[PDB]
Amino acid sequence: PSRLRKTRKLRGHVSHGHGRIGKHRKHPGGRGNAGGLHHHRINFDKYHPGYFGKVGMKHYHLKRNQSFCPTVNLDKLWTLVSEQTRVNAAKNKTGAAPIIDVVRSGYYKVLGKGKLPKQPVIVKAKFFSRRAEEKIKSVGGACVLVA
Amino acid sequence: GVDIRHNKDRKVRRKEPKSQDIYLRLLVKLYRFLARRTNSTFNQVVLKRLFMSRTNRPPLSLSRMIRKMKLPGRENKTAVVVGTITDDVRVQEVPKLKVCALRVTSRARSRILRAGGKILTFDQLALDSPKGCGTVLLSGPRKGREVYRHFGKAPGTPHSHTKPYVRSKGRKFERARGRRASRGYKN
Amino acid sequence: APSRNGMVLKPHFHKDWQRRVATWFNQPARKIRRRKARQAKARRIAPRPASGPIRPIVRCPTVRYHTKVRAGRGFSLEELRVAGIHKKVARTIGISVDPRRRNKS
RNA sequence: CUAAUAGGGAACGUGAGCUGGGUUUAGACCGUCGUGAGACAGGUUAGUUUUACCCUACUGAUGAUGUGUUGUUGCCAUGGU
RNA sequence: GAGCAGAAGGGCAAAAGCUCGCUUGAUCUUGAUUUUCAGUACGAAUACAGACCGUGAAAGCGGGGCCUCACGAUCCUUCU
RNA sequence: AAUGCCUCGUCAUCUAAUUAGUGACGCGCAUGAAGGAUGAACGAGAUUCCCACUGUCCCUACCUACUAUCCAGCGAAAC
RNA sequence: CCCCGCGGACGCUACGCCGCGACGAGUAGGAGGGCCGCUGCGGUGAGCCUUGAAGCCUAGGGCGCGGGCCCGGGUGGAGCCGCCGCAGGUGCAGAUCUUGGUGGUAGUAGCAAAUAUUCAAACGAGAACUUUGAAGGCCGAAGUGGAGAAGGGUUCCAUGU
RNA sequence: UGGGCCACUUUUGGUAAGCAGAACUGGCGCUGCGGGAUGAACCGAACGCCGGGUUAAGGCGCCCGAUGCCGACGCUCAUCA
RNA sequence: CGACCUGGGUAUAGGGGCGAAAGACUAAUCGAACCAUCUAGUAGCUGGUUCCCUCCGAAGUUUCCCUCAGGAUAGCUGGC
RNA sequence: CGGCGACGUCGGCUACCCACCCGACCCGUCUUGAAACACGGACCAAGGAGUCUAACACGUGCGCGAGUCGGGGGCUCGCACGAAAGCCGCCGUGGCGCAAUGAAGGUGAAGGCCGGCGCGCUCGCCGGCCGAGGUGGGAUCCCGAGGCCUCUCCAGUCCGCCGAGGGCGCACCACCGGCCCGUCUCGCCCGCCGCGCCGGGGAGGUGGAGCACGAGCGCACGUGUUAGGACCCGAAAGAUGG
RNA sequence: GGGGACCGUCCCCCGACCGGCGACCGGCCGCCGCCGGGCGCAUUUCCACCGCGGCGGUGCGCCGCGACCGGCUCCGGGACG
RNA sequence: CAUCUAAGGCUAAAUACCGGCACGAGACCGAUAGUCAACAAGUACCGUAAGGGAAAGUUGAAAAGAACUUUGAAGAGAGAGUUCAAGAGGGCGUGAAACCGUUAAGAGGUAAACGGGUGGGGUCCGCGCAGUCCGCCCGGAGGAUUCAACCCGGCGGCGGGUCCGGCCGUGUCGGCGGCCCGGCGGAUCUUUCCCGC
């Protein structure tokens, strides 16, 4: 809505909010990111450190599918299966542990943030972290690798 | 003439909700009367939070609510939040909670009710405790927002750990000069 | 000129973009035209499936998608050979055939 | 020569008053400087000087107000000198 | 009232000057701080901490010059 | 000297009187040889003088034509 | 246990109403409010209107701090407005602004290059200018004469206005 | 916005300047009002629309509000007061 | 009477022509014609920038910049 | 309490003209300073200048919420409206968020208390519990001795208010710890189909836009910055083809 | 692959106990009110008119006067310490 | 090790479309706008040429477009007539401002104009010109579907252990009742009865 804007309130004020001394001119200072090393250097250094220069090795023809490895933490591991899977295993008299295949749910790596409830579980994944495997074995579970 | 300054005369605060939600305005009418006609400071805090903007009323997760209600001496008390109660899927067991919230997520509401809990709106809370007795007034994390990572001292100053505004994150985006001693300086 | 904190923005509008702008006001008409052509084609092939030929089961290539299965271009010649279907009769009875796809497993 | 041939101001009075010798465009010559284009508070020659009918000022020319109309003869305020 | 390399100012006497003896702390490192300052950088400087050393009988002192000046980004190159 | 700052150079001549002209001199700021120096004829070229001639002037006057002026008709512009 | 009386003002669009206290300059600039204004769309006003819409004019009556608005009179002759939202090519004194129109100047400057006109008559409503006649003059054959090229294109010639 | 300027006082260059350059506070710029006849800055005082009272700085022959007080004490005569 | 004047027909075209030379002339245009387009070229520079009331209310200073008629930066401002 | 009232008077005036007293220089603009002998403006009418797109940032409103979003496609008499609306769910592909850090190879965020043991060696095998530590502040909330009452009292019946002190402490702030990735220094152990120039672990500093019980996503609006003709008008120029 | 069982939600029912008849509704009662029709037909009730009537409210068509009270203010007398 | 088989050829569909033919629509513009062009517009006109390029819509329902008389040489008038209207008369809907003529009123030697304060005059306005109104009471003289209380009927409002139903929320059991004789789901178990190794 153009009726809610400052231009309706600036009718009758000669400078339109841009001043009488400095006026509103075309491009004082340059166009775009002009002069980022000369007369806008303070702004670029203050808010964008690291902007200028090269760092690291360049790699031609990056295929992002090769490095596709979504990760899931331990605190969300039991959300990949139904609540019925969880409650049946908890009240199970035998030592049967459900299998959570994180690859089926769309994750490849199991990271170890958080804590697990105290009941065994078999976790299928492409990759595990050291602490994720340690906590899974702590609750009596097992880590099994898939490809 | 009087030697005074007028630049701080007008106090800047919400005197009413900027929202046009008529259900929020009705229970603002309710708690405006309660704050005026009682001596309870609980009603005054609740009323001023009803005026507040959404960023000033962050959501409260189930885990944080459970943790604050598990502190000693808070049993059988009503957890009141002026805002949304949100499910947390990182908690496995939900105790019996009595809660009053402006909004409750569908899944958080189902979990609370299965645990044997109780959910009240703010008009039911007024009937249940007009003076707000036996309540635990909680708030969500106010600074749990992405904007607060960018706030603070400028990223290009020493000892500042504030996130810069970058379109993309990678080894080519704002990592060379001013970020490592090998390229000019680090600070 | 930059002003306080901000993002270094690089718009790609230095190249007379206003002379090549694709508006989409014919999108609802294109959806109607496609829908009418689909209906007309289905009427043309009277009892035959409206979608087209049957496509094979195919695993998606990369490591991002090899857990997923979709429809391929056509049945390979080794598949038709052991199914007992001639590779020239297959297309006439609604079986799509892809002669350039092999079977690794 | 004369009594004397005092010094000055008025947008260094005065160019819709003139003139245009000088300076101060474009042509050209000489000396000096510069590799050169070119330059010279150096010299020299040739080089378009537009408009007033408006307002005021001023110069003159009719008139105007008041004595009822109209005419003759007059006075002198004031200004110049 | 001399000298301390140099401009000037400060400082300094069994010193910081002069002469000897032994040496390489003018080395390897991470942070913090001061100075200019926007409390950005560079340069310079201060106080530590961890190595490895020098010197001295030792306490200690020393990571350049008694202090205040003597210097230099991105990109590229070159060496380790 | 159309080339010399000092400079209105110095001397002579021209005049009553000449920063002008001509002749002469020359350590010449900074003349000079394919351009230097001469030399008739020529020139809407620059300069000085003399005779004659005159309203250029002393010192203005008068006359003629067309205007301006007034009238009938017509009728702008600058600003 | 009010009752010989059967009764008792207003209010509170709560985005409303009421009370008390202090305060009030403002360029550049920012913000808020606008029952200020223009145009169009969705709703709504059982809206207005040929018994007279819009527009315009008005020594008419008023309201508002103001932006502006309402009403009377006249002209006009066919459409228009209020409220809730929505959307803008949405408000002018300037820009040596653009286009159009109009003043003062001003009945002014001016209608002054190449010697020159006059008398009578006719036609005609009307004659300094037309026509005829009579004079006086000019071009003076390198013409103000008689013919062509280029260019023009019917200006040629009659008749009429 | 990133042209400032002015005044008391301190203060540098300059013979000086309504000059140029600093420090401090205030002002003008952005500010009207009473007074200084007049005036960006001085003196008083800062401002919604008004009635009454009283003042500031400044005044009270007449212009022009207010001494039209029987004001006090002296000083001073100027033919540029 | 000549290196004379002149008609018409031809030739030379824009960084080109033509010039007994003046940067002259090349259709009133010449130290680079005219026409259309790129093109609404760019402008730290000049001019303008349209209704009302209420509230708050500055700066001409710091640092850096081929910076000195401009910016970034801190300061001063307003709003939430 | 008085007077006065229809063809002459009564009241009114913002509005019309005129008179008088005081005040009063012409607006716009740049500017330290304009009435300026600074520029533009003879007059009137109509037109006339911060826009739209994209991208960010923050604020605000709305829906859902560890998710969110169908925008591309498809299905629905193909069509007045309707080019709308509705729906899809094995159309969520995908985007953004949910994980960071390193140039990369890669790695990748749980502790606290009570016990027996090697040696409770700065510590390794377990047990039991609990589930992001602690300090100082901290709205709110909870307890609360003691008071506040009636016509009066010996003696409790029910609850309301004030209340010194005490307690649990939201959000947030300061600080101290802890965890993850990079990089140093020191050091000793462990693993085994590959006994390796193999793999893992510890302590103490330090670098990170991190963790430490999520807050985001979509839509709308506002403001600011930017690229675009970019608030409007304005060069001297440059190029292409005639 | 089908068919089952189990679990989680649901949608209807067969019944009772619990809180309510509610802002989900009817029937009976009880109280109250209104309306219509009778009866009541006159010291009641109502209607309209008159008094230069009174008590209230508002307000005088225009122009004016006075009084006392209160607020603010400028003055003047008198007396006491 | 993987993957294809160059240096020959054809091929629809989905895609594009500011020219053309024919259509439909619009929160667009409304005659200085919208195309330059609403109209005899790429026209008139300009330039040697390449090229440049306008302005310009509206009587009335119907021409019923003013017969006739009269002055004038006519333009132009005065009468008359048509029309609802010519105060619509062929560039004719309305008809602003600037500017001009005339009439009326007022004024005028410090150029006008303006702010504040009054005064005078004028034009209008006021149903101005004996000045509001209405509640109760008192008195006077009059009228009347005539008042209270009762009866009949209708309709409401409020209350009632649920008086009676109908129910509503929360649980509560046989699940008789739903994988045949009720559904939808589940990353829960299974033929240990059944169609594919």
Ligand SMILES: [Mg+2]
């Ligand atoms: Mg302003």
Ligand SMILES: [Mg+2]
């Ligand atoms: Mg203006």
Ligand SMILES: [Mg+2]
């Ligand atoms: Mg530079």
Ligand SMILES: [Mg+2]
């Ligand atoms: Mg203020």
Ligand SMILES: [Mg+2]
């Ligand atoms: Mg002079």
Ligand SMILES: [Mg+2]
């Ligand atoms: Mg002249």
Ligand SMILES: [Mg+2]
């Ligand atoms: Mg003159």
Ligand SMILES: [Mg+2]
């Ligand atoms: Mg000359």
Ligand SMILES: [Mg+2]
């Ligand atoms: Mg010359």
Ligand SMILES: [Mg+2]
């Ligand atoms: Mg030479």
Ligand SMILES: [Mg+2]
């Ligand atoms: Mg000549």
Ligand SMILES: [Mg+2]
């Ligand atoms: Mg005299």
Ligand SMILES: [Mg+2]
């Ligand atoms: Mg050391």
Ligand SMILES: [Mg+2]
């Ligand atoms: Mg030292």
Ligand SMILES: [Mg+2]
């Ligand atoms: Mg000479």
Ligand SMILES: [Mg+2]
């Ligand atoms: Mg002479």
